[PDB]
Design a protein around this ligand. Structure first.
Ligand SMILES: Cc1cc2nc3c(=O)[nH]c(=O)nc-3n(C[C@H](O)[C@H](O)[C@H](O)COP(=O)(O)OP(=O)(O)OC[C@H]3O[C@@H](n4cnc5c(N)ncnc54)[C@H](O)[C@@H]3O)c2cc1C
Length: 451
């Protein structure tokens, strides 16, 4: 049996461990954190994630989708909150076929861990990768208290997240051609209790957004009617606009409270533990990192956040990571040798990773705008007309990304064609009055092949 060592029992690492192990591979998976399935007296994390068709399908192939969805809340649409103005649900699709699932990150992780072990993978916790000797095919791990352990490896999979140690190690033997693009927003996780969300009649089967331009909040529901809220806000005010809100200004929980009372007055009443959450939950960092190479010969490869850190504004990092896991296991299973598999995997996934990284950056503007411009309303309306006329040709980009398995790069290409098509048709027309719809439709049939 072929042997593989995987670093990182997160989302991609644990899925790929299952897929390889059930195909007969001898799999050893190493994880820095303790086993989350071993219950302790400690809290438990309420981090939420949006699971979309890509990620769901990857779990489906692994035989885990039913188990995961049993513990997921359906989000049928977006609830946009603007002060006053009673929240209006914007449905994703026309029935519950087109939905996004809200799932607890650590619940998902436990299910994946069970899945990997059921398939035959051996999982080793409390062991973080420190370094790799590629020439001698050995690596060094250590626990939190630093005592070290060495292991031989044959094939190394870096599924160890956005600060990948495998990636760091590879940079010693190949030029990764890395370029880091920092992002000015930080994030803070906050909580709405089940009592609070019921009291304010917050819809459980929706994704909620409080847009506010340069900053915003989003909330995803949990099975117990609590919500996990994320604030996205600049780390610092520009020297340009020093007065503008930023984490630097929010010097403590009381400052955070005044900020929410002023800028999010309808959300603040729902955040009972705002002060405490704010001070005890560290501010997170966001970034996009792009790599020229993802592998070292047939010896090591990167997967998921290790390969392509992205900003979280499209809710697709997990989805992309699980999709990566399927692709990597597919290539490894059937290739002539590991070097061939890793090159083919990289060639396949790299253009799709670049596309979703770009689309995720673009999606911030869509989400954070408090109201839509007059002409963008007109384009969206013409687009829905075209979608009705040619539903296999005109598919809104968000829907291609979120509710289909179309490769990200094609979703982006078709999305580009569609937006341009809408702009020329919309120009100099105040409403759908002037716009000859059937002229636009064979413009659609011209440049958008049916799918
Ligand atoms: C604010 C925010 C919101 C998000 N929302 C969504 C969403 O709604 N939908 C979505 O699709 N994605 C979302 N994402 C992205 C998502 O969290 C990640 O893309 C995804 O977890 C990446 O999966 P992964 O397996 O590659 O990495 P991870 O899930 O991060 O797992 C990496 C694993 O490696 C371990 N590890 C790290 N270093 C070492 C080491 N040296 N040795 C051993 N083990 C190590 C870690 O402990 C961890 O278990 C969000 C991200 C953020 C920051």
């Amino acid at each position: 049996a072929r042997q593989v060592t995987i670093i990182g029992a997160g989302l991609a690492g644990t899925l790929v461990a299952r897929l390889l192990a059930r195909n007969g591979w001898q799999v050893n998976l190493f994880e820095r954190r303790p086993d989350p399935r071993i219950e302790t007296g400690a809290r438990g994390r309420s981090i939420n994630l949006a699971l979309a068709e890509r990620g769901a399908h990857a779990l489906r192939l692994a035989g885990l989708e039913r188990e995961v969805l049993a513990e997921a809340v359906m989000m049928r649409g977006r609830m946009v909150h603007v002060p006053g103005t009673p929240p209006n649900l914007q449905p994703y699709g026309r029935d519950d076929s087109e939905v996004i699932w809200s799932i607890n990150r650590d619940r998902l992780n436990r299910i994946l861990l069970d899945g990997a072990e059921a398939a035959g993978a051996s999982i080793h916790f409390n062991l973080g990768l420190d370094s790799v000797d590629f020439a001698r095919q050995r690596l060094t791990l250590s626990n939190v208290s630093g005592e070290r352990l060495e292991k031989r490896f044959h094939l190394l999979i870096g599924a160890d997240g956005c600060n990948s140690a495998v990636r760091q190690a590879m940079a010693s033997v190949v030029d990764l051609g890395e370029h880091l693009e920092t992002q000015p927003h930080g994030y803070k996780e906050l909580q709405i209790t089940p009592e609070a969300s019921a009291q304010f009649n917050l819809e459980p089967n929706a994704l909620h957004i409080w847009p506010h331009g340069d900053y915003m909040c989003i909330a995803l529901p949990n099975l117990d009617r609590s919500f996990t809220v994320t604030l996205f806000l600049h780390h610092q005010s520009p020297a340009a606009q020093p007065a503008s809100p930023s984490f630097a200004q929010l010097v403590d929980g009381h400052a955070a409270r005044r900020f929410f009372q002023r800028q999010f007055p309808d959300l603040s009443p729902m955040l009972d533990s705002l002060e405490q959450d704010f001070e005890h939950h560290p501010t997170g960092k966001l970034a996009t990192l792009r790599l020229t190479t993802w592998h070292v010969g047939g010896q090591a490869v990167l997967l998921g956040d290790a390969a392509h850190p992205m900003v979280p504004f499209h809710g697709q990092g997990m989805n992309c990571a699980l999709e990566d896991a399927v692709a990597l296991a597919e290539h490894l299973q059937s290739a002539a040798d590991n070097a061939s598999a890793l090159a083919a995997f990289t060639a396949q996934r790299q253009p799709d990773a670049l596309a979703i990284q770009a689309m995720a950056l673009e999606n911030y503007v869509e989400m954070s705008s408090k109201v839509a411009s007059p002409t963008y309303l007109l384009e969206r309306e013409l687009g829905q007309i075209m979608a009705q006329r040619q539903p296999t040709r005109f598919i809104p980009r968000y829907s291609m990304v979120t509710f289909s398995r179309l490769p990200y790069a094609q979703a982006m290409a078709r999305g580009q064609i569609q937006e341009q098509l809408l702009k020329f048709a919309v120009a100099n027309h105040s409403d759908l009055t002037s716009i000859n719809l059937d002229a636009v439709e064979h413009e659609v049939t011209r440049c958008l092949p049916p799918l």
